[PDB]
Design a protein around this ligand. Structure first.
Ligand SMILES: [Zn+2]
Lengths: 267, 275, 325
């Protein structure tokens, strides 16, 4: 059965080309003694040394190209562009370089916003959050992408399963298992990554006691794992999302769980 | 006349009765002055006064239509103040460059409708009404996100079409979008992509100064919404206005059954203020 | 398959006797015309039915014939059934206009008024099975105990109305009005209960009313309406809170007065449900003779543990008489 076809991504492709061209082209201000050439090609090439499979690019540089009009697609609509920013970036690496897990972490956001200033309009958007860490937790694997099959019985399907449920694989199978059947869990084909949760709390100097400061969950996914310390202020990359923990889905209880794909000890 | 269900507050009637309410001191026993202050700042949130419509004529009845039926009356009031902004702009010709400033969202924030006695006195007979309350706040809950416009997906093809929530429920079409494609397979609901709106929750003791003595005061959880969210901290003894709500709770556990005794919370459309 | 065995008591002609009890009266025009019309006039809700007058009526209907079947024993013998039977009769004799009723005026009366207006109109247009009698009330029927100064008639053993100990309470008093006395304990704060709650459909509309029976009910969706049903395909329907009829609900437990406790054991509390007007009447720490039908409300489950069925009961409040005004 042919899948006809796929649609449409529209702007997503425009942002793919813009971001690719941006990570390619300068991205250089300084002249003479630089800080010149490239810096991002040189960033990836410097990255070829340790091959830790992450990149660092500044948001301020990204705003300079289109005058911030490029940064807007990457701001409010950002999570729509996560699968595009990754594979797209790989389309670059495949060209300039010779086992692929890529964690993109933006940084240096124009304005830092407190946990109190957190709104439901800020979802799917980069927001810098400052505050002290409380209750770090031990690092465990995420399923990331999995092969769970067969699933009745020989299929061996490896795809998707990227979203957090984790249920379920084996749906719309094999071709053709028609499972149902067992899930079935296979952990040897499934690459894992990271992660550690930290519960971020507002700094005590800002909060007007009587306050009773309101903590909120930030899970660290990415190589920024372990970079966080208890009793200290940290700046993160926003990706606010939500996690299940109001209407029903008929033929749901949610809360704000902040994500950070980048960490720094600033504060 | 466009009768609307059981609330029976007529569209294309009360809109005009409110539209000619404009430009009044009057009376009293501001009004357009404060609105003219409002148009520059872009702060929206028109606080109103209440009482205005009483004893003033016309709209002696509108006060009773709002008090007895605040749900619709607030929405209609917002539409009318919006179109009275639209009619304010055409008077001065080109304003603020240009039409975008009208597009921005506005709302009425009614307050001080009669003097209600406590939470305790309240009859179960009035469940859609504007209700004063007073008491300290024991805690301000973390923000829960609320559905506004829902997003959906399928394995085919995949297509991006989505539908708004409207009433407090979510029904996704079985099959399917665009086209067609089909097949029957269940819809995939993306959790993060859809829009959200701020809903806090605020616990309130009933007037600790006014008590059966010695029985400990009763909790009233008022859920607020929008801008009002995270606009307060704790222990504020002053006062709050808003629409009373009784909604069913799911009990044991699972089972998809209703406990048949509806819990009660206040929508709290407006807040105010200090000591 | 579920055998049946006749009993001398029959509710059919007893209803007739209730109808003869109502609106035909002398001794106290009659009291049941005025007391009913003042409710119909909507300045009054609680209907206080005294069993004393029911006692007075039988004398006129016996000796003084023509002789009839007894109520005062037959009421307190059951006393739940009469709330759904003795009280529905009021619907048949009630003054229709009654006076100056209008519509709004009242909140939520306009809702149902427009319901019956649009229903009458649309039905009379369609013909060119009705809203339940419990939704349209806006009043509550409450029996009261006969102590009594006139109980000395004498019907003797007829009295409960025996201001009994909580210890005196037995499993043989369930479904029979009993006065009890003790100190109010814990006096839980009032919350709205539910009765019908007619949900609203979408496409073709109409209405359906789901009975609130026992403690809880299961909510339904589907579509009941034949129009939305099968074409096309099943209309969606939601509950409308404005349309529902709410009856105040307050529960409170009552421990024994402790003088009624023997040399041994322990104070035993008894759970008491309150409805309608009688709400808030009760206050903590106050000795009160509370009278009411004595009933179970099973089981909500559990259901594995007991086994069975082990009712655990409660007392429905009917009347309230507190010591020391
Ligand atoms: Zn329908």
């Amino acid at each position: 059965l042919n899948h006809v076809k796929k649609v449409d991504d529209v702007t997503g492709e425009k942002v793919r080309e813009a971001f690719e061209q941006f990570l390619e082209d300068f991205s250089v201000q300084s002249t003479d003694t630089g800080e010149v050439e490239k810096v991002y090609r040189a960033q990836i090439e410097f990255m070829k040394i340790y091959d830790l499979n992450t990149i660092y690019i500044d948001y301020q540089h990204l705003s300079m190209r289109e005058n911030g009009a490029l940064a807007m697609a990457i701001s409010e609509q950002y999570y729509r562009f996560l699968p595009f920013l990754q594979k797209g970036l790989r389309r670059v690496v495949r060209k300039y370089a010779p086992e692929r897990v890529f964690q993109i972490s933006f940084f240096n956001l124009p304005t830092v916003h407190r946990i109190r200033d957190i709104r439901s309009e800020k979802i799917g958007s980069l927001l810098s959050i400052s505050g002290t860490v409380t209750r770090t937790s031990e690092v465990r694997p995420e399923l990331y992408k999995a092969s769970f099959t067969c699933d009745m019985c020989r299929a061996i399907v490896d795809n998707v399963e990227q979203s957090f449920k984790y249920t379920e694989p084996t749906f719309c199978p094999n071709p053709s298992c028609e499972n149902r059947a067992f899930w079935t869990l296979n952990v040897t084909r499934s690459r894992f990554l990271d992660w550690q949760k930290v519960r971020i709390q507002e700094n005590a100097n800002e909060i007007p006691t009587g306050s009773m400061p309101r903590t909120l969950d930030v899970i660290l996914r990415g190589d920024s794992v372990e970079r966080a310390k208890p009793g200290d202020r940290c700046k993160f990359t926003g990706v606010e999302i939500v996690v299940p923990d109001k209407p029903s889905s008929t033929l749901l209880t949610y809360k704000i769980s902040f994500l950070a794909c980048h960490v720094i000890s600033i504060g | 006349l466009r009768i609307i269900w059981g609330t029976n507050v007529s569209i294309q009637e009360c809109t005009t009765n409110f539209r000619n309410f404009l430009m009044s001191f009057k009376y009293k026993f501001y009004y357009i002055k404060q609105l003219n202050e409002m148009r520059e700042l872009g702060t929206s949130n028109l606080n109103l006064d209440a009482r205005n419509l009483l004893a003033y004529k016309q709209t002696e009845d509108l006060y009773h239509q709002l008090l007895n039926y605040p749900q619709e009356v607030i929405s209609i009031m917002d539409q009318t103040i919006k179109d009275c902004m639209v009619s304010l702009i055409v008077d001065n010709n080109l304003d603020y460059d240009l039409d975008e400033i009208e597009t921005k969202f506005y709302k009425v924030r009614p307050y001080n409708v009669g003097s209600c006695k406590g939470m305790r006195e309240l009859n179960p007979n009035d469940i859609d009404k504007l209700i004063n309350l007073k008491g300290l706040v024991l805690r301000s809950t973390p923000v829960i996100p609320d559905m506004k416009v829902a997003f959906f997906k399928c394995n085919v093809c995949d297509h991006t079409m989505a539908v708004e929530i409207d009433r407090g429920v979510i029904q996704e079409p079985a099959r399917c979008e665009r086209i067609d494609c089909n097949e029957p397979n269940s819809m995939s609901l993306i959790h993060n992509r859809c829009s959200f709106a701020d809903k806090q929750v605020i616990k309130l003791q009933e007037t600790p100064d006014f008590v059966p003595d010695g029985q400990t005061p009763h909790s009233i959880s008022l859920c607020v919404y929008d801008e009002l969210v995270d606009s307060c901290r704790a222990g504020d003894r002053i006062e709050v206005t808003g629409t009373f709500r009784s909604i069913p709770i799911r009990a044991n556990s699972r089972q998809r059954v209703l406990k048949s005794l509806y819990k009660t919370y206040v929508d709290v459309v407006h807040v105010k203020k200090v000591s | 398959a579920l055998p049946s065995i006749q009993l001398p008591v029959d509710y059919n002609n007893l209803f007739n006797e209730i109808t003869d009890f109502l609106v035909t009266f002398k001794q106290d025009g009659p009291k049941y015309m005025a007391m009913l019309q003042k409710v119909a006039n909507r300045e009054l809700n609680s209907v206080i039915i005294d069993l004393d007058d029911i006692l007075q009526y039988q004398n006129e209907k016996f000796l003084q014939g023509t002789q009839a079947d007894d109520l005062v024993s037959a009421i307190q013998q059951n006393a739940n059934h009469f709330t759904e039977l003795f009280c529905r009769a009021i619907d048949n004799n009630m003054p229709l206009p009654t006076k100056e009723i209008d519509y709004k005026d009242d909140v939520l009366d306009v809702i149902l008024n427009q319901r019956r207006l649009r229903n009458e109109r649309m039905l009379s247009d369609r013909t060119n099975e009705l809203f339940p009698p419990n939704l349209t009330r806006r009043y509550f029927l409450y029996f009261k105990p006969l102590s009594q100064n006139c109980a000395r008639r004498y019907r003797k053993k007829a009295i409960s109305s025996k201001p009994l100990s909580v210890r005196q309470i037995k499993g043989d008093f369930l479904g029979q009005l009993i006065t009890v006395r003790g100190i109010i304990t814990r006096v839980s704060d009032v919350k709205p209960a539910v009765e019908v709650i007619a949900y609203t459909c979408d496409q073709c509309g109409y209405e359906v009313f789901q009975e609130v029976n026992s403690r809880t009910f299961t909510p339904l969706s589907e579509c009941t309406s034949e129009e939305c049903s099968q074409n096309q395909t099943k209309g969606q329907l939601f509950m409308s809170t404005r349309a529902s009829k709410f009856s105040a609900f307050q529960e409170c437990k009552i421990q024994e007065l402790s003088q009624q406790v023997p040399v041994g054991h322990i104070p035993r509390s008894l759970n008491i449900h309150v409805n309608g007007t009688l709400v808030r009447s009760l206050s903590p720490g106050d000795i009160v003779d509370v009278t009411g039908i004595f009933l179970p409300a099973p089981y909500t489950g559990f259901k594995a543990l007991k086994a069975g069925l082990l009712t655990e009961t409660y007392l429905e409040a009917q009347f309230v008489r507190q010591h020391k005004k």
